[PDB]
Write a protein that binds this ligand. Sequence first.
Ligand code: DXT
Ligand code: DXT
Ligand code: CL
Ligand code: CL
Ligand code: CL
Ligand code: CL
Ligand code: MG
Ligand code: MG
Lengths: 207, 207
Amino acid sequence: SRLNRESVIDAALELLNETGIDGLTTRKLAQKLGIEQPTLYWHVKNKRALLDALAVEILARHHDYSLPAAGESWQSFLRNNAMSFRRALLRYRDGAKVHLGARPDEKQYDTVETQLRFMTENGFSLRDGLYAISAVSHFTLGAVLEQQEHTAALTDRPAAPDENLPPLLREALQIMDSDDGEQAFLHGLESLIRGFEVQLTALLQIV
Amino acid sequence: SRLNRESVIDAALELLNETGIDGLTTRKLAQKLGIEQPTLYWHVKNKRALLDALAVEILARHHDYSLPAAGESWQSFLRNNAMSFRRALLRYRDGAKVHLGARPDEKQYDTVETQLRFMTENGFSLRDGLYAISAVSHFTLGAVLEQQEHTAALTDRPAAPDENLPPLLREALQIMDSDDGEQAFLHGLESLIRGFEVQLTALLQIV
Ligand SMILES: C[C@H]1c2cccc(O)c2C(=O)C2=C(O)[C@]3(O)C(=O)C(C(N)=O)=C(O)[C@@H](N(C)C)[C@@H]3[C@@H](O)[C@@H]21
Ligand SMILES: C[C@H]1c2cccc(O)c2C(=O)C2=C(O)[C@]3(O)C(=O)C(C(N)=O)=C(O)[C@@H](N(C)C)[C@@H]3[C@@H](O)[C@@H]21
Ligand SMILES: [Cl-]
Ligand SMILES: [Cl-]
Ligand SMILES: [Cl-]
Ligand SMILES: [Cl-]
Ligand SMILES: [Mg+2]
Ligand SMILES: [Mg+2]
């Protein structure tokens, strides 16, 4: 079939949903596209190049809140940003593992530079704005990785028997399993953002 | 060599450091131990059982702050807990990916039940105490996963050229690369803990 960059990415993303990241291979990608392995190699040199490409394109296609609204508060920005990033990550199987494989690509430079600029324009030092940005990013990635890898694990083997589960754990597992960890995520996100505002407002005060 | 549970885990942990999680296989484990594949199978049925086992034993051996001190504040507990968990995760290559592969094992039930009990005894509902616990866990796992997967990626291929890197990103990457993300982690951790205290103290007040 067609092997322009866009069509190769569509095919790889389709495969990632069928196989997960551990089982995606350039060999299965060639089979999906109806081509021989040496033909694919011209286009895609190895799995790492593919995964670097997917990490960028997933956000390009599906992460719609990279940039703040005109007049948006930094608190509202981090909230809308984190929600949009979580969604984009959860859209593909093993999405958070796909993202973690790289730091900002050249194609993202403009976007992430503006993010950093925006924090600094709202009273943060670059260092403190970068710590806020990183905290949000990592909190969100860990939350999504736990969701996703819980699915992976379950398809091999069932959860343990609650013959043995003590009461609060039973109840807690039932709690993290009533939605797809959204409540836990949104509650933790507000905690994080307030934590940051307390720090920013304190200036040089012992706090 | 010896194939009691303990010696099998020592050998697998040694292999994980040599190969990383993606490349650890029951075949290379058999070679390390000097045994045939069918002999290993008696002891270790597949990679998933092995990885579930490693996730538990890494914390059993190297995570020394699972439980609060007598009279410790919940704020001090979450801080010491998170620091000890980060260290235990960073001790082995791809440690955070090893952990994420499962939820609490039966062998951990007693520990994690006590953690949940402790929050509830310090003014949190089980739901809010579980959200604090989860937020900390996920923040810490994301921070460690990013560190570790940055190493994995670099061994394939170099970071991009700063011919193109805009100024704040250059400076930010230089910032997340001056220690092993410890400063960013400790700063975000204090933000998270304060965020939680603001929430707990507010009770029913609009906040
Ligand atoms: C500033 C970026 C950065 C700086 C230094 C080291 C890094 O590894 C990064 C990133 O990887 C970032 C992301 O991945 C973003 O998710 C990122 O790339 C992204 C985006 N493309 O819109 C975001 O929305 C960001 N968001 C907070 C989750 C976040 C970035 O802000 C950073
Ligand atoms: C309460 C546990 C839990 C509840 C519901 C769903 C879960 O997936 C979990 C865990 O996985 C926990 C951990 O992994 C701990 O890291 C966990 O197992 C652990 C430990 N063994 O000492 C910790 O120190 C915990 N810490 C906050 C990082 C954390 C646990 O509190 C939870
Ligand atoms: Cl075609
Ligand atoms: Cl073509
Ligand atoms: Cl021996
Ligand atoms: Cl033996
Ligand atoms: Mg990133
Ligand atoms: Mg866990």
